[PDB]
RNA sequence: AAAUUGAAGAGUUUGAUCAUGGCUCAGAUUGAACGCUGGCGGCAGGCCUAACACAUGCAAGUCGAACGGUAACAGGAAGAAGCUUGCUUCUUUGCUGACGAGUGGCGGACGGGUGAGUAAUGUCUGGGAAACUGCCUGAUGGAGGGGGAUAACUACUGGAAACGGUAGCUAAUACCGCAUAACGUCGCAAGACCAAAGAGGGGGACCUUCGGGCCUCUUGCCAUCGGAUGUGCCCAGAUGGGAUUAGCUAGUAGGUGGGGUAACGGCUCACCUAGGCGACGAUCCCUAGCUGGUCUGAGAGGAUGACCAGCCACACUGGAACUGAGACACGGUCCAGACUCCUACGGGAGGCAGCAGUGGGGAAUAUUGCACAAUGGGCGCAAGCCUGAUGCAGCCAUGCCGCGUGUAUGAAGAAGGCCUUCGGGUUGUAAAGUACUUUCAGCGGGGAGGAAGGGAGUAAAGUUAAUACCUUUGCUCAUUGACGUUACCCGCAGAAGAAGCACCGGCUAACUCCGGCCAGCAGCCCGGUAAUACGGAGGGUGCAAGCGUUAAUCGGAAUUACUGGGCGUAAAGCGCACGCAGGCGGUUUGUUAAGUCAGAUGUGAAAUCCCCGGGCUCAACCUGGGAACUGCAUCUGAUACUGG
């Protein structure tokens, strides 16, 4: 199915995830349909590390796209903070 | 990655004082400055165009103590930046951390200033920065750490700097052993005996 | 309103089909000269309405044989 | 095979192959009956064979042996061939 | 606001000159190799050759909430106790927590590897119609009632093994009818026809044949129409060289009809017509994965396609199908071949171009490592299990980047070395001496972040007949890290553990002494007895944990000249002419809007390049946003020029 998940970009020991909408059969960092945000897990709290568009995410979830557990937690925290 | 050999040899080869010694004497009393190094130093051969360009580049490098890879990257970034390439290059050279520490007065020479920086005795905005090539930005505050304020090296350097000229872009307090980088120096603030266009022509050929 | 082409009929010996040559004016990618280029298409001509030399208007459709994927729309000029 | 799942898959695949072969041969026979009735020109026998062939063809198309498109093709072809006689 | 601000020459033909013209050099770059040398770290990269052959270990499993079950270990158990009476130690029970084997479901078509084949059966760009699509998702309905088997198991038995055979028994969400049947299929229509499956949680009473039926919730099942995704198919243009390859083609081109496919189609067959491709290079031959991109360049171009991402092809060689939504299937099946191995000689088994690794080839490319902690994947209600993907670690200076190998003072300028007009000069503040410091490495002590979740509790809401069960939402408690002795910080001691390589005739920065066209050097133009060119020494120059040589691409090379060259004598006007294809074409009007131009829309994947910022102590690196992607198609206009 179509899933919304993270693609682990970045450097060694300093990950940077791109929230991508991708067909669940492709590789992690492989072919994806649309990038709907990012997530920097080692942000300094001085800057922003969660800029995932909720509009297109909700549009895709409305079309049957699946949300991974980490992306679900990210959406929950983004809704709580904002 | 460092030049550790004789210092006055460089100033004798360049025919100009490179401030490679503290200043307890005049260089004329320590070496034959007007004579090139080596057995054939009395002769002065006619320099080519490439000779003059290379000698000016080497003079700037030996002034700032920068090796060739870092200086080439400096020229690359200066040619990338907008404006005149030469003053961009000299500003990038003056922005270094050890250069500022020397100009601030905490180092008698840029070698001992680089030793102060590298040995984790210099702070930038309260954060100990031990990179000599660290680009110091405007409004930055550079200070000696609490543990290194007890060294007589810094005292002698402070005195030797008080007997020098004062740079316009540095607000230093010798008591607190701290200073502020107000701004990048314009072309008119550095030495006038440095032809940046020679380096630009050498690196653009 | 439908996307179509236009060319001259160079062969009609086959039954229910014609060969239309679409000539186009393309600039040379290197030397900048505008050169002629010919695109010959096997077009389906039901009723055998088109003769050699007709300037015909054709459109693309589903494959009708091994080499025919275009069909005729109308004839503009008729072999004279 | 080296993996256990591969061995079980081979066993299941040959069992399903035999089952599908039986079903496909039955369907092919019941369609050949309609085709032979078409050849003979017997329209009553042709419609009888078509009425016998239609349900099992729909059933095998519904059970996943053949596609619904193939069942529709068979039905339409044999209907158009029967209508060419009477 | 920014995101094209970009272009260097030199040596060598001559006694000398100008021109022509080739050769060579100065610049970047690399999946590099070799020689000398070698301190640390961060980030990346690492069989380019034999798509040669492979020892060994792992790389795809999962579900008891589908099913009969119980073989193993943990418990409950009824009954018999060694007896040191509160340890109770073995006889039987799937009773349950679970679970080997087995049926069944899903997954093994993903993820991972290689570039052999492929010059268009592929790729890129832009369009299109005649299609299917498991899991995910929206809507509407249904989900009734039966049957025959079969694995396991049991008994016997054939084999060295691999693996079977016979007879009997049993279950299901396995299999098969029946009923049902429409906005589904066939048909113009009438009508005809087609499906299914249960399981789990809890429970108030009513009724129980003591299993439970009965209620509710969750989940699963079947049919149809959609969405999303993926895939199949078609057209145009582009995508190497060779004419010392010019003709090619019989299912060949088209048509009618039958068949076939999920789908159009010579996809296939019968018949008929006689066509189709080709000088805009068909056919044939050699080479080759394609692209975003990378290197170079001022640009146009030239070269190239390793890592990263998309597409394709392959899986020992050749062929084929089966299952399945999807394969003609790396770790599936059948056959044939070569090869290797086991054998009781009758038969068997295997495919590292998965991760390590071995032999071989080569100038050359690494560990038979740790963990599923994070991301993702498969299965499962979930817990969870599996995952050589992946996260990390090991090795290599292979590259980029950063830091260190100390700092200050230090003379009549010591010694030795080298040169010397023998005065001295230089090595050279260089050393020694003195004062100071401790980055990195060494020893010891603290110590983030990658960690989200998941579990158990309670409380609220929803659901319900129910204050159970379940779902969501708060809070509480105890936990989850391979890296790892982390990054980072703090303390100790002592300059203590850390500089080499090439060059010095000109091009090209850097000069003297000593030893015979020999030894030797040489990228292009020295050595025949005072050689700045050989070899050594002193000195100096350039780079620096690197330095050189070799190999390769572009530049310089305007030296294939589109931008941007020439042909009287330097290479170059066919011996001359006629002339088909082709190229170009006097002048006016009208018309068209093909070239051309303008605007808009769609697209031009992400990464990369560039600009402004942000985070790593800086940098490399990572990253936010923008610009760019100079292209193609469509639509609407313009009519000067070219074309009709």
Swiss-Prot record, chain A:
Protein name: Small ribosomal subunit protein bS16
Biological processes annotated in GO: cytoplasmic translation; ribosomal small subunit assembly
Keywords: Endonuclease, Hydrolase, Nuclease, Ribonucleoprotein, Ribosomal protein
NCBIfam families in the record: S16
Family statement: Belongs to the bacterial ribosomal protein bS16 family.
InterPro entries: Ribosomal_bS16, Ribosomal_bS16_CS, Ribosomal_bS16_dom_sf
Induction (free text): Part of the rpsP-rimM-trmD-rplS operon.
Molecular function, one GO term: DNA endonuclease activity
Assembly with partners or alone: Part of the 30S ribosomal subunit.
PANTHER family hit by this protein: 30S RIBOSOMAL PROTEIN S16, SMALL RIBOSOMAL SUBUNIT PROTEIN BS16M
Organism: Escherichia coli (strain K12)
PROSITE patterns registered for this protein in UniProt: RIBOSOMAL_S16
Entry function: In addition to being a ribosomal protein, S16 also has a cation-dependent endonuclease activity. In-frame fusions with the ribosome maturation factor rimM suppress mutations in the latter (probably due to increased rimM expression) and are found in translationally active 70S ribosomes.
GO cellular component, as recorded: cytoplasm; cytosolic small ribosomal subunit; small ribosomal subunit
Curated annotation (Swiss-Prot), chain B:
SMART domains: Ribosomal_S4, S4
Keyword Cell cycle (UniProt): no
Keyword Transcription regulation among UniProt keywords: yes
CDD domains reported in the protein's UniProt record: S4
MF term (GO), any: rRNA binding
Domain S4 RNA-binding: 95-155
Domain of life according to the entry: Bacteria
GO CC terms of this entry: cytoplasm; cytosol; cytosolic small ribosomal subunit; small ribosomal subunit
GO BP field: cytoplasmic translation; DNA-templated transcription termination; maintenance of translational fidelity; negative regulation of translational initiation; response to antibiotic; ribosomal small subunit assembly; ribosomal small subunit biogenesis; transcription antitermination
Keywords of the record: Antibiotic resistance, Repressor, Ribonucleoprotein, Ribosomal protein, Ribosome biogenesis, RNA-binding, rRNA-binding, Transcription, Transcription antitermination, Transcription regulation, Transcription termination, Translation regulation
Role description: One of two assembly initiator proteins for the 30S subunit, it binds directly to 16S rRNA where it nucleates assembly of the body of the 30S subunit.
Similarity field: Belongs to the universal ribosomal protein uS4 family.
Protein name as annotated: Small ribosomal subunit protein uS4
Source organism (scientific name): Escherichia coli (strain K12)
Curated annotation (Swiss-Prot), chain C:
Pfam families, A to Z: Ribosomal_S17 (PF00366)
A GO CC term attached to the entry: cytoplasm
Matches recorded under SUPFAM superfamilies: Nucleic acid-binding proteins
Keyword rRNA-binding set for record: yes
Matches recorded under PROSITE patterns: RIBOSOMAL_S17
Quaternary state and interactors: Part of the 30S ribosomal subunit.
GO MF annotations in UniProt: rRNA binding; small ribosomal subunit rRNA binding; structural constituent of ribosome; zinc ion binding
Domain of life the protein comes from: Bacteria
UniProt family annotation: Belongs to the universal ribosomal protein uS17 family.
UniProt lineage: Bacteria, Pseudomonadati, Pseudomonadota, Gammaproteobacteria, Enterobacterales
Naturally occurring in which organism (per UniProt): Escherichia coli (strain K12)
PANTHER family: 40S RIBOSOMAL PROTEIN S11 FAMILY MEMBER, SMALL RIBOSOMAL SUBUNIT PROTEIN US17M
Other facts: The strain missing both S17 and L29 grows very slowly and has a rather unstable temperature-sensitive phenotype.
The name this protein goes by in its record: Small ribosomal subunit protein uS17
Function noted in UniProt: One of the primary rRNA binding proteins, it binds specifically to the 5'-end of 16S ribosomal RNA. Also plays a role in translational accuracy; neamine-resistant ribosomes show reduced neamine-induced misreading in vitro.
Any single biological process term in GO: ribosomal small subunit assembly
From Swiss-Prot, chain D:
Keyword line: Ribonucleoprotein, Ribosomal protein, RNA-binding, rRNA-binding
Annotated SUPFAM superfamilies: Ribosomal protein S20
The keyword RNA-binding belongs to this UniProt entry's keyword annotation: yes
Subunit annotation: Part of the 30S ribosomal subunit.
Highest taxon listed in the record's lineage: Bacteria
Known function: Binds directly to 16S ribosomal RNA.
Family statement drawn from the similarity comment of this UniProt entry: Belongs to the bacterial ribosomal protein bS20 family.
Region named Disordered: 1-25
Name of the featured protein: Small ribosomal subunit protein bS20
Gene Ontology molecular function: any one: small ribosomal subunit rRNA binding
InterPro entries: Ribosomal_bS20, Ribosomal_bS20_sf
GO biological process: cytoplasmic translation; ribosomal small subunit assembly
Disulfide bridges in this chain: none
Gene Ontology CC terms: cytoplasm; cytosol; cytosolic small ribosomal subunit; small ribosomal subunit
């Amino acid at each position: 199915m179509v899933t919304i998940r993270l693609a682990r970009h970045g450097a060694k020991k300093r990950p940077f995830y791109q929230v991508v909408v991708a067909d669940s059969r492709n590789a992690r960092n492989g072919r994806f349909i649309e990038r709907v945000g990012f997530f920097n897990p080692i942000a300094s709290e001085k800057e922003e590390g969660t800029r995932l568009d909720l509009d297109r995410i909700a549009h895709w979830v409305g079309q049957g796209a699946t949300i991974s557990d980490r992306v679900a937690a990210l959406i929950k925290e983004v809704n709580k903070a904002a | 990655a460092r030049y550790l050999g004789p210092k006055l040899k460089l100033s004798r080869r360049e025919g100009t004082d490179l401030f490679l010694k503290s200043g307890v004497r005049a260089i004329d009393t320590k070496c034959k400055i007007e004579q090139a190094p080596g057995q054939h130093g009395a002769r002065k051969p006619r320099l080519s165009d490439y000779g003059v360009q290379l000698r000016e580049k080497q003079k700037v490098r030996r002034i700032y103590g920068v090796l060739e890879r870092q200086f080439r990257n400096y020229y690359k970034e200066a040619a990338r930046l907008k404006g005149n390439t030469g003053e961009n290059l000299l500003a990038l050279l003056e922005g270094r951390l050890d250069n500022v520490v020397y100009r601030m007065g905490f180092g008698a020479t840029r070698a001992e200033a680089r030793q102060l920086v590298s040995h984790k005795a210099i702070m930038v905005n309260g954060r100990v920065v031990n990179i000599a090539s660290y680009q110091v930005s405007p409004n930055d505050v550079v200070s000696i750490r609490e543990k290194a304020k007890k060294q007589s090296r810094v005292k002698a350097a402070l005195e030797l700097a008080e007997q020098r000229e004062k740079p316009t872009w540095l607000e230093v307090d010798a008591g607190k052993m701290e200073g502020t980088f107000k701004r990048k120096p314009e072309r008119s603030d550095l030495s006038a005996d440095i032809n940046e266009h020679l380096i630009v022509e050498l690196y653009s050929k | 309103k439908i996307r179509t082409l236009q060319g001259r009929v160079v062969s009609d010996k086959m039954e229910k089909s014609i060969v239309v040559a679409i000539e186009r004016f393309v600039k040379h990618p290197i030397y900048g000269k505008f050169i002629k280029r010919t695109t010959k298409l096997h077009v389906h001509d039901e009723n055998n309405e088109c003769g050699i030399g007709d300037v015909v208007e054709i459109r693309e459709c589903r494959p009708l044989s091994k080499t025919k994927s275009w069909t005729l729309v109308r004839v503009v000029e008729k072999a004279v | 095979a080296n993996i256990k799942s591969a061995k079980k898959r081979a066993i299941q695949s040959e069992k399903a192959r035999k089952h599908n072969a039986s079903r496909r041969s039955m369907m092919r026979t019941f369609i050949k009956k309609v085709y032979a009735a078409i050849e003979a020109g017997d329209k009553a026998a042709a419609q009888k064979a078509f009425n016998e062939m239609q349900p099992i063809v729909d059933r095998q198309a519904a059970k996943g042996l053949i596609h619904k498109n193939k069942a529709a093709r068979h039905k339409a072809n044999l209907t158009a061939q029967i209508n060419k006689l009477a």
